[PDB]
Design a binder for this molecule. Structure first.
Ligand SMILES: *[C@@H]1O[C@H](CO)[C@@H](O)[C@H](O)[C@H]1NC(C)=O
Lengths: 128, 133
């Protein structure tokens, strides 16, 4: 059994900065990579970012490279997605996901790599 | 082959396919792994790939299911040794259908644990390193 729970979100003005935090529980944290997925209304829940178990390799989606940052605190077993300089067409539901147990190597660029998902929090950019 | 087990390892002792060794849980995992539909024998060619190993190499789906089967077993000590011998020593690979790899994301020890692909071209069968136990 495991539990992933987010914190942060809501409405914020155009250009503002917000970070979502996501705490994991139930298993060893540092082994498994984790990532953040963005689902706009009426679209596929596409990935925005992911970070490996060690922290040494991160992959960002091309839409958001250079604006978002990802990190983890293995002692507290948490993962942070910091967001700055928000733009239009970025309002969406942000879901926190954890890499499941795998025998083969997997890519962070796939939904099927992650088994455990949170309920996710809403992010709203309203102005311009 | 392990003492008290029929299926785990090359070759086999069992008489019927329904028969299981001493441990109910570890031998079921090894039986399911050894009854993988799509394998590649030593020197066999399939799906445009050639394996150059004396042991048979198997599909990544069978290896992933075998990994989860061994990690969720009740008899911890036998499954521990079987996992730590298969996944971590022989340095084998598994083949699956994926977009073409562009580069290795993270490489720890002799194996690549996260890779990256080009989404533009179709899917092809390719080899991938096995995760450690
Ligand atoms: C393993 O057992 C099955 C049936 O029990 C048999 O088909 C197969 O040939 C055996 N393996 C070897 C190496 O003889």
């Amino acid at each position: 059994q495991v539990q992933l729970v987010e914190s942060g979100g809501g409405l914020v003005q155009a250009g503002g900065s917000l970070r979502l935090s996501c705490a994991a529980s139930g298993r060893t944290f540092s082994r498994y990579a984790m990532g953040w997925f963005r689902q706009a209304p009426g679209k596929e829940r596409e990935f925005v970012s992911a970070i490996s178990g060690s922290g040494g390799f991160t992959d960002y989606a091309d839409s958001v490279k250079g604006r978002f940052t990802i990190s983890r605190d293995n002692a507290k077993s948490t993962v942070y997605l910091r967001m700055s300089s928000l733009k239009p067409e970025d309002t969406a539901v942000y879901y926190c996901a954890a890499e499941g147990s795998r025998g083969s190597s997997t890519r962070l660029d796939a939904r099927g790599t992650y088994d455990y998902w949170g309920q996710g929090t809403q992010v709203t950019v309203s102005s311009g | 082959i392990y003492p008290g087990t029929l299926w785990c390892g090359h070759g086999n002792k069992s008489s019927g396919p329904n028969e299981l060794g001493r441990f109910k849980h570890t031998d079921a995992c090894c039986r399911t792994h050894d009854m993988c539909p799509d394998v590649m024998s030593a020197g066999e060619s399939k799906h445009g790939l050639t394996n150059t190993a004396s042991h048979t190499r198997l599909s990544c789906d069978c290896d992933d299911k075998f990994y989860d089967c061994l990690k969720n077993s009740a008899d911890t000590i036998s499954s521990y040794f079987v996992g730590k011998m298969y996944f971590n020593l022989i340095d084998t690979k598994c083949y699956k259908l994926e977009h073409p790899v562009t580069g290795c994301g993270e490489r720890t020890e002799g194996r690549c644990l996260h890779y990256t692909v080009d989404k533009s071209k179709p899917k092809v069968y390719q080899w991938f390193d096995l995760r450690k136990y």
